[PDB]
Write a protein that binds this ligand. Structure first.
Ligand code: HEM
Ligand SMILES: CCCCCCCCCCCCCCCC(=O)O
Length: 407
């Protein structure tokens, strides 16, 4: 068949589900970067995608993603016992107490940043979030971050995910940002190992610097650096979800009141923001052995893409996925495959995002602050979601005026 890379790139979140709807199927064979690719969508497809006896990640992600989004040698590219041993290192960071600590640091940094926002008179909300998140996560992770460098590090971390999927010179900036952030994280790992940096025993940078692999060897410093950036970078990417929290509050009538007046509502609300809004489009794996599934061939070595956005909008699962309705989560049975904005399956046994607890905790802080503490005006602007952008955002970035926290 024809190469459809251009069609995918023009509609990265919806290309797969639009083609599925046309064909009346949850899977179809296509071709990207000249490679035959099976595209999958929905709960049943997610369950097979997460079967590690049939799928592997090693070598699956296009190498332009190593130079930017993920780095080289990190957990995303591992399989089998090597993967599970590395994954445990990340999971150990995520205790309720440690997640709460990061949420508290983020609230503090948000409150610290407000006076600057008031003084500007008008802000692009998305643009203002990267730095407080950077400051909170570095402190949490045991990464020293001088006051006068926080801004620059926040821009570099942002560039890894926000400029990575840009078909322009912004991609070149993402590559330089990656080189810089790796070198910085590497100096941090080296200083922890030499004892010149006193990160605490509970902190991410300590855990990663002192992690021993399956042969009782420390991670090479570059790999430790990449894994540390695998904590810092996606925490800063929560800026996207926080912007969507603001977008939902602005565009969906009744949400603000319910959040104000119903205490259990915030949990439902942040889950629905993750279900509803596009963010991580799709994940890629390679078939590890010959099999067939639902009348489709999966020859060993076949590239396979699992459409996360389409799965989160699958009508069989949700009935009315096109609506923004937090109360739908009252009927959710916590299935590991039917709701997958940060991946599916098991956190320890597969590649599912270990950052979900942090994301939920921080999105709740954001919701709380935006309804209970912050006052702001929202001028006329284009709030529509840019489905052509990676990551997707409201076209305006969400512009606020007259921000303050007397509220
Ligand atoms: C900002 C919102 C986030 C989104 C949309 C997101 C989404 C995802 C997705 C889709 C995956 C891949 C699942 C797969 O390969 O099957 C993933 C993996 C990962 N996430 Fe996140 N994530 C976010 C935040 C975070 C945070 C805060 C952390 C901090 C620890 C984090 C750390 C990771 C790591 C280390 C992996 C690789 C895990 C593995 O391969 O086993 N993420 N994430
Ligand atoms: C060859 C073109 C590749 C296009 C690159 C696509 C990048 C995906 C963008 C999704 C939003 C980024 C989410 C942050 C993820 C993370 O921090 O790990």
């Amino acid at each position: 068949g024809p190469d459809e890379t251009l069609s995918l790139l023009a509609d990265p979140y919806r290309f797969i589900s639009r083609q599925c709807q046309r064909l009346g199927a949850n899977a179809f064979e296509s071709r990207f970067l000249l490679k035959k690719t099976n595209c999958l969508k929905g709960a049943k497809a997610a369950e097979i995608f997460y079967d590690t006896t049939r799928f592997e990640r090693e070598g699956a992600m296009p190498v332009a993603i190593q130079k930017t989004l993920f780095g080289q040698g990190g957990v995303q590219g591992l399989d089998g016992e090597t993967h599970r041993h590395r994954k445990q290192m990340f999971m150990g960071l995520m205790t309720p107490e440690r997640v709460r600590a990061l949420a508290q640091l983020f609230e503090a940094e948000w409150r610290r940043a407000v006076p600057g926002w008031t003084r500007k008179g008008e802000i692009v909300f998305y643009d203002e979030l990267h730095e407080p998140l950077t400051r909170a996560v570095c402190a949490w992770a045991g990464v020293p971050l001088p006051d006068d460098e926080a801004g620059n590090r926040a821009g570099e971390l942002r560039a890894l995910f926000d400029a990575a999927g840009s078909a322009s010179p912004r991609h070149l900036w993402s590559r330089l940002a990656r080189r810089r952030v790796d070198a910085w994280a590497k100096r941090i790992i080296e200083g922890i190992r030499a004892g010149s940096i006193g990160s605490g025993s509970g902190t991410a940078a300590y855990a990663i610097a002192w992690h021993r692999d399956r042969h009782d060897d420390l991670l090479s410093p570059h790999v430790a650096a990449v894994e540390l950036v695998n904590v810092l970078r996606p925490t800063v990417a929560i800026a996207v979800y926080i912007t969507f929290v603001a977008h939902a509050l602005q565009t969906c009538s009744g949400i603000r009141a319910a959040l104000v007046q119903q205490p259990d509502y915030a949990e439902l609300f942040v889950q629905e923001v993750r279900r509803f809004y596009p963010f991580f489009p799709a994940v890629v794996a390679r078939a590890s052995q010959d099999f067939e599934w639902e009348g489709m061939a999966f020859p060993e070595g076949r590239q396979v893409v699992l459409d996360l956005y389409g799965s989160n909008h699958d009508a069989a699962t949700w009935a009315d996925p096109q609506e923004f309705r937090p109360e739908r989560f009252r009927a959710w049975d916590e299935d590991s495959f039917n709701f997958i904005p940060q991946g599916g399956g098991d956190h320890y046994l597969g590649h599912r995002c270990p950052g979900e607890w942090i994301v939920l905790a921080i999105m709740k802080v954001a919701a709380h602050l935006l309804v209970n503490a912050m006052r702001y005006d929202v001028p006329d602007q284009d709030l529509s979601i840019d489905f052509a952008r990676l990551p997707a955002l409201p076209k305006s970035g969400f512009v606020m005026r007259n921000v303050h926290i007397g509220g």
